[PDB]
Paper text:
Two different conditions were used to crystallize the AldDH with propionyl-CoA. At pH 8.1, AldDH crystallized in the monoclinic space group P 21 with one tetramer per asymmetric unit (ASU). The AldDH crystals diffracted to a resolution of 1.9 Å and the structure was solved by molecular replacement. Interestingly, we observed additional electron density around a cysteine residue in each of the putative active sites, which indicated a covalent modification. Because the enzyme was crystallized in the presence of propionyl-CoA at pH 8.1, we assumed that the corresponding cysteine residue was propionylated and modeled this residue as S-propionylcysteine. The covalent modification fit well into the electron density, to our knowledge the only acyl-enzyme thioester intermediate captured in a crystal structure of an acylating AldDH (pfam00171) to date. In three of the four active sites of the tetramer we also found coenzyme A bound in close proximity to the modified cysteine. In the fourth active site we were able to fit propionyl-CoA, which probably resulted from an additional soaking step before freezing the crystals. Interestingly, we observed that the S-propionylcysteine assumes a different rotamer conformation than the non-acylated cysteine; this has implications for the reaction mechanism. The rotation of the S-propionylcysteine also opens up space for a proton transfer relay that could serve in the deprotonation of the CoA thiol.
Author numbering:
A (entry chain B), B (entry chain D), C (entry chain A): 86 to 524
D (entry chain C): 43 to 49, 86 to 524
Write the structure that this text describes.
Amino acid sequence: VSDGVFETMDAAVEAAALAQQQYLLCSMSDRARFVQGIRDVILNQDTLEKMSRMAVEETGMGNYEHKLIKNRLAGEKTPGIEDLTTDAFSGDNGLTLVEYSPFGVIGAITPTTNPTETIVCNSIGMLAAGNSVVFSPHPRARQVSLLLVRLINQKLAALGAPENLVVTVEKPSIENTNAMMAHPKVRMLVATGGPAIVKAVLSTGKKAIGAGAGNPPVVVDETANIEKAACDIVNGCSFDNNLPXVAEKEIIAVAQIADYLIFNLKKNGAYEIKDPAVLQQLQDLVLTAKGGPQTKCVGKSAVWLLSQIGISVDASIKIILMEVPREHPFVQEELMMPILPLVRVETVDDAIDLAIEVEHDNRHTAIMHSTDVRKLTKMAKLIQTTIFVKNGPSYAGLGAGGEGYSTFTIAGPTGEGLTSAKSFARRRKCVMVEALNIR
Amino acid sequence: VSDGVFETMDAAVEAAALAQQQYLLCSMSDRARFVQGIRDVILNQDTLEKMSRMAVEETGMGNYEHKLIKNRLAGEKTPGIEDLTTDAFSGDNGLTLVEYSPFGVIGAITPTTNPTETIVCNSIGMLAAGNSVVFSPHPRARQVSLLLVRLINQKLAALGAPENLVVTVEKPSIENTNAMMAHPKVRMLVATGGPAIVKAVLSTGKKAIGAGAGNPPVVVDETANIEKAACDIVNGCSFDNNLPXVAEKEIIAVAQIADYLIFNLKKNGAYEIKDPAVLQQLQDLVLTAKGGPQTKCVGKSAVWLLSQIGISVDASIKIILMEVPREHPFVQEELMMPILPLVRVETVDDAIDLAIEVEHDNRHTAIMHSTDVRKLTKMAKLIQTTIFVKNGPSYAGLGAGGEGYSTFTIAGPTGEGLTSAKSFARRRKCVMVEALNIR
Amino acid sequence: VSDGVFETMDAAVEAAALAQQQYLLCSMSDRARFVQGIRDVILNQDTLEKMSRMAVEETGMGNYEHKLIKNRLAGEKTPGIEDLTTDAFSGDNGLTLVEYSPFGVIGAITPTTNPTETIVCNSIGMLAAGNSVVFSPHPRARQVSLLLVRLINQKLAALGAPENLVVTVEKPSIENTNAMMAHPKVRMLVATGGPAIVKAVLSTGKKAIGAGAGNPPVVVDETANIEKAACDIVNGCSFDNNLPXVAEKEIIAVAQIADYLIFNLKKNGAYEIKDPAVLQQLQDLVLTAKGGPQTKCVGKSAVWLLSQIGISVDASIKIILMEVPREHPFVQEELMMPILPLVRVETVDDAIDLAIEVEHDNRHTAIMHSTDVRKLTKMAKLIQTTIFVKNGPSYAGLGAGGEGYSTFTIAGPTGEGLTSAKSFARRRKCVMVEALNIR
Amino acid sequence: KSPDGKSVSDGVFETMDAAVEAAALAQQQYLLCSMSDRARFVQGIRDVILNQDTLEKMSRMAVEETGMGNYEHKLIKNRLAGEKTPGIEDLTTDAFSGDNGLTLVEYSPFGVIGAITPTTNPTETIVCNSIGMLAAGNSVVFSPHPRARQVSLLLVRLINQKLAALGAPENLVVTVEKPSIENTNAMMAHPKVRMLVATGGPAIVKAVLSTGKKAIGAGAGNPPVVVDETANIEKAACDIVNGCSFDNNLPXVAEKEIIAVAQIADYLIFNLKKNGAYEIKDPAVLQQLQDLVLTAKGGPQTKCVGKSAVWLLSQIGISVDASIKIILMEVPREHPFVQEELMMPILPLVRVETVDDAIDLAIEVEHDNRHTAIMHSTDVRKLTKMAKLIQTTIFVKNGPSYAGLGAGGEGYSTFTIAGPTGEGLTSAKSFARRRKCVMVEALNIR
Ligand SMILES: CCC(=O)SCCNC(=O)CCNC(=O)[C@H](O)C(C)(C)COP(=O)(O)OP(=O)(O)OC[C@H]1O[C@@H](n2cnc3c(N)ncnc32)[C@H](O)[C@@H]1OP(=O)(O)O
Ligand SMILES: CC(C)(COP(=O)(O)OP(=O)(O)OC[C@H]1O[C@@H](n2cnc3c(N)ncnc32)[C@H](O)[C@@H]1OP(=O)(O)O)[C@@H](O)C(=O)NCCC(=O)NCCS
Ligand SMILES: CC(C)(COP(=O)(O)OP(=O)(O)OC[C@H]1O[C@@H](n2cnc3c(N)ncnc32)[C@H](O)[C@@H]1OP(=O)(O)O)[C@@H](O)C(=O)NCCC(=O)NCCS
Ligand SMILES: CC(C)(COP(=O)(O)OP(=O)(O)OC[C@H]1O[C@@H](n2cnc3c(N)ncnc32)[C@H](O)[C@@H]1OP(=O)(O)O)[C@@H](O)C(=O)NCCC(=O)NCCS
């Protein structure tokens, strides 16, 4: 029985192409069993712990406790076949049905920051829609990704699925990703990664979903529950060491509440840097010569980052907080580290304007703490982000403490929003002329 | 006041970019007024006839009568702002709203087969979704396209719209089209045209919706209403001289009813060619040396085509019919001419199998005449086309005699189906954590 | 042709029963034409003004300018056949369709407060769903109701409807109403009226929709836009002289803003009574010996009510306002007069508790002015009213300045909410076993 | 023209007044519970009936106490109620946003619901009603039939035990120690009952609609199954025998007369007998069965309702093995077996000339119940015509009638099928009041 891992990308694609042809003969009940199997794989406590620990050990990024939550979020709240609704319209001209049907072979690029969550979430959605999926995982997460694919293949084999619904290559690489993106039998590309790989998949001549960059501002105005806001912001920013695409990456605080907010942030585990010499040491540690984030620091804990500049703090410290001007690189750059700059502004309207500016027209994610329905509406409407979270941590936008389903492929540039099974399906219209209008 | 036509593509794109920024400040009521304005433009009887006549004259393709119908179909049954529905979910974690918001500037490539219908349909959908649109019309439809753009800009100015919501260039060209595709301020590309241009917009690094090619088979089995089938098939095949992407392009008839079908086809205006020499004359006329359709004959009437091989017939002749083997170029090629080959097969199951084969995995459009719900289901399910029409003319798939809305941008490889305003919008999720859950 | 007005209730019902049998043979396109026909009847400006003036002059209740708005609201925002959506579910077991189909003959009881609005709203919804309707109008609004029915029948005759889709009797009476309730061919009763007649239609052994009483509190807390709240409250309370079921009938104001609210209410046309002797005069005028509203005062203007106690004011006076304890009859009673008591409370939580109490478990309508999303949510969730309006006049709950459709039959005990065509339809399920599953 | 077709309180109270008062207090407390709480309680009810020992006990006990139905099929129907009754996911939200802000439409509780349950589906209805009503945030007072007293009270106690272990307010689901029609009348009259739900015959439906309260009435049917010449006749015979004999013809949807186009009627009958139909051709034997199963007034004998074909045949001296599932007879349309809703595995066949005649006759013998009808036909035009004209709450094409209840057809299940009051297949939504929340000029974030 195939374990889904192939020596060459071309062999993987051919196998997934044959698999998806056979898959088309399977029932929706079969699909639901396979979907549940993937859930059972990642939600099995032993595998859940193994995937969460292994990703941290292999990538050096994130933390075990939060990957437990994120992997479980992927397993529990990714939509299954119930996502594939049917539209119907009946009248004098008969019945029209609109269905979500498979693309075929989907090629999926997955990140090193959420390797297992994206595989679980992509796999469930793509197989629910009747596709097979070829994964090109990031080489930095090769071992955990290949093991997850093999575990999924083992489970699907036990469930009587066609072999090779979920496949990858023995040696993930840029070149194998290139081969996947260029293979004629790949019908759609899905890229969860940085803007480079997204531009690439959108340059292949193929249908592509691209999950893009963010720089999420969190605005706090004078009407917010400041004590809850501080707790939410620390939790959101430090969740998996700031790896989630939605995670807070700069605070924009109205002046009249900024000090009390800072006070409560420190109460909730923020380590405040005031010494500009200490701040400069941190900028030297976490920024490249080009001014971008140091990969060696991405997804490291606040404790670890502080230890690297000679500062020893206990486990209660969750973020590194500093009040800085808006031009500071911690504000402008998407660090993907639990380093959270705060910019003080005079009014909520200034805060909204600055949040739009620093979000850089990524239109990805933004957060606001405010009880004023008018200011919540104004910021949400103006900033036009794929995800907008009000009065909660950023991960409420992923279904953790907010209503809705979860995803780990959030599509901004291509506009799909929170991808689910429907996103991996072709919309088909079936017209029964002058029949089946039984009203 | 700008008329919407610019000397350079870069000027058109920059003007649309400013226009859309201003458009974001307009109400949904404003959008509805602008949508209605575009409907009023094309549905105005004088403009309706002028657009239909000018398109036929300038392109040499289609017929005036059917372009009246198609332009009216675009003006009347293209969804407006009511397409932009809202999803809501409420519970213990509060309320989550999901909305359709604008992309920004959309670059739209329009074909010379449906120049005005596509402009009307794209404009309504894209403006309804809060976008501006830059059109790159086909050079062979330059004059009618630019006049429509001018008339739209005139109407929108009278309605108080931002200037330059709908723009184009003075000199349409493949060079200007490539310039639009490369322009950084174009946020999404929409290509209604051949596979080459669709592959191109999908190779730009941008979100792109691409139309697809088809080769629509119409299967007729022994349970069909043969008299109605023959009428539907002639009407559908000869609609705008076989220009529509959905139009029937080969008949696959169960042998037991083929002769009765052919008899009724002839009664409905089919000119049957049985002389293999006359057939060869037709092939030499309508096929290039490479075997593809001759541009000079695309969209020409059956009367005109027969006259070019010296056969004079009255206006009651709508299609040219011939019984040929499946390998014949008229079967294999997407002629876009009212030339309709018929292949005879033993059983409905063979008809379904052959229909799948000759559709060439375009998964675009197929048609079936049959009253057997099992065979209707089998063919529709297996052939997996974006549009499937049962017991009607192909154009029932576009809302003309079938339930649903109309479009003239039917997505091919990108899977949106019949594009509408929704297709030109980004999906946005707004999460009100632990509030607005008022159940 | 029949003008739809019959000498006996039995003849009206028999005619409507035959009409609906014939109506079943009409298309959805026919239904849509008839719906548009009724809209055209009431939306014709000259007819709109005639109906509005005639109702006020015949009943003595309401005012002309606002009946213009309400009749237009009924004609413009009552859902048509688009309300009758189709649900579909497809899978291994085939296709299931769920449709909204006619009840048959519906007997509709209409009020003297909104005679023409209810006839328009009921007629459009009931005919859209494929029913016929027998109206039993209130005797006080006899002639305006019969004139509307005759105009509908004339319009429908011209549009080619079966005669007698909409019928009534020449002499409305409680006896004819009882005969409608008792008639075996009436398949559903709809009662828009006071609780006695609603209890009656729910005691007939028939499916019945019943209106409810209300006593709508409007809460204003310290976060509200007080200037806007004052304007909204005056407009909502005095709308058609407080006849609408949704209209504000007591203010519960948080002490922090109560005086400034009263100040702004007076600037918007509130006449404030502080003299307890004058207040006692008003109570003597508007209350019966048993403490309920005087019918002779229901729907009278504030100008008229003040003149009846010897106070002469100009037309800028829209409501009579008094700060009183919660036990005051004007708070406790649904006056249906532009008399608006204000009760002052310590906190928004006290305001919510009191609003729930004085709403008397009608669960009909409540209104809140507050910008705190938490307090808006708390009150909306706790008071459990069929309509809840936030930061607007009460009539925004009927589609006048709020999103959604309008109705003038807001169900009370029967739970349908804002009745529309769906409410007048039977839900039917059509199961195509193992076919038409074409995904 | 093919002649072969085409191949701690336990929830049980001394008086109705006490039960209603307890459920009213319970529902006030329930309003403070979260949707997560409701979901736990819904799952608790599912766990009660789907527990294998309780599933078997409920199914066996209902048959033994009522004398109606059969154990194997009540296992299926009870499991169908537990598995496919919608939960809180039924309570969807509508939203509309624009220049005037945001409007939300929600499904909110009625309060105390009084539910009358039948002796033909006593546990399935309790399970199905309980799940839907609690999902929507109501409490429910059950008034079961005296003939199903013991099994109904046990189920209520088991539900109360489970909900107590899950931390629910006491008495979300209640009933009375002594079920009686008089207690049903008392429940219908109680001021604190906000809605009545009646799963029963036409008299009880009329009664709940005569109370001054909102009532959902799930009425009678007489479901015809039309078979035309385009049908898969072999499958139709199998489906018809299975649907008619399901729980001994107790389900409201079950086939109760065949209307067969003449050209396939004999081949259909041959296949019906192949699939377990015992055909009576002897008019003397047919008269014997009529004397057995019809009362002096001509209605069904309660002693025979829900009895097996085997048992019914034995009562007229005919011994057959357990492969016999229905008693089949070809008769004129006027025959009482056609006209009456027997709720017995007795299935008359009426032969007609054409499918259009079959449709006309099916409409006629369905008696404007507009409840359930079934058609076997592959012709999309005749399927549409019959479905459109007969206007039934449930229409099943090319399957057994119980495919209309989510068993072999798409959709959810219910055991309260509302024709007269029009709710259709009742679910949690049906037990909720629609509420509209209008946020004027805010929360329009498009
Ligand atoms: C938001 C938009 C909306 O407001 S929705 C529209 C719903 N409007 C209402 O329900 C208004 C409630 N009606 C009332 O309060 C009263 O009718 C008011 C306005 C005080 C008028 O007084 P009055 O003339 O005495 O009418 P009434 O209903 O109180 O009773 C008078 C007798 O007439 C009867 N009646 C009632 N409706 C009908 C009818 N359609 N046809 C024949 N008779 C009717 C009543 O039963 C009553 O007779 P009886 O004394 O009960 O025997
Ligand atoms: C991935 C990360 C370690 C970047 O560090 P890095 O040193 O630049 O390493 P990269 O692998 O990304 O860069 C080398 C190439 O590998 C490409 N690449 C990204 N994912 C890849 C994948 N699954 N397979 C093959 N190549 C991949 C990158 O596009 C990049 O191309 P480039 O050299 O042209 O820029 C991390 O810091 C990061 O930026 N993650 C963002 C990705 C993301 O947004 N994921 C969304 C999670 S929901
Ligand atoms: C276009 C047509 C009338 C004539 O074919 P033709 O002689 O090759 O004419 P064209 O060369 O201009 O056809 C498209 C060509 O111009 C380009 N082109 C297409 N649309 C263009 C546009 N709006 N602007 C600029 N260039 C365009 C294409 O890149 C292609 O280039 P190519 O000649 O190198 O292949 C006919 O072949 C046709 O319409 N085919 C199908 C197109 C279609 O799918 N229409 C569906 C509309 S709903
Ligand atoms: C089996 C049955 C037919 C017994 O018939 P019966 O012996 O002649 O009459 P009953 O024993 O029911 O008692 C007579 C009255 O009790 C009433 N009744 C029915 N169910 C009742 C209940 N749960 N509680 C109190 N009274 C009830 C009815 O008014 C019935 O009137 P009826 O004789 O006109 O039918 C009957 O009890 C029954 O439940 N039928 C099911 C009808 C139905 O549509 N059920 C829906 C199943 S999902």
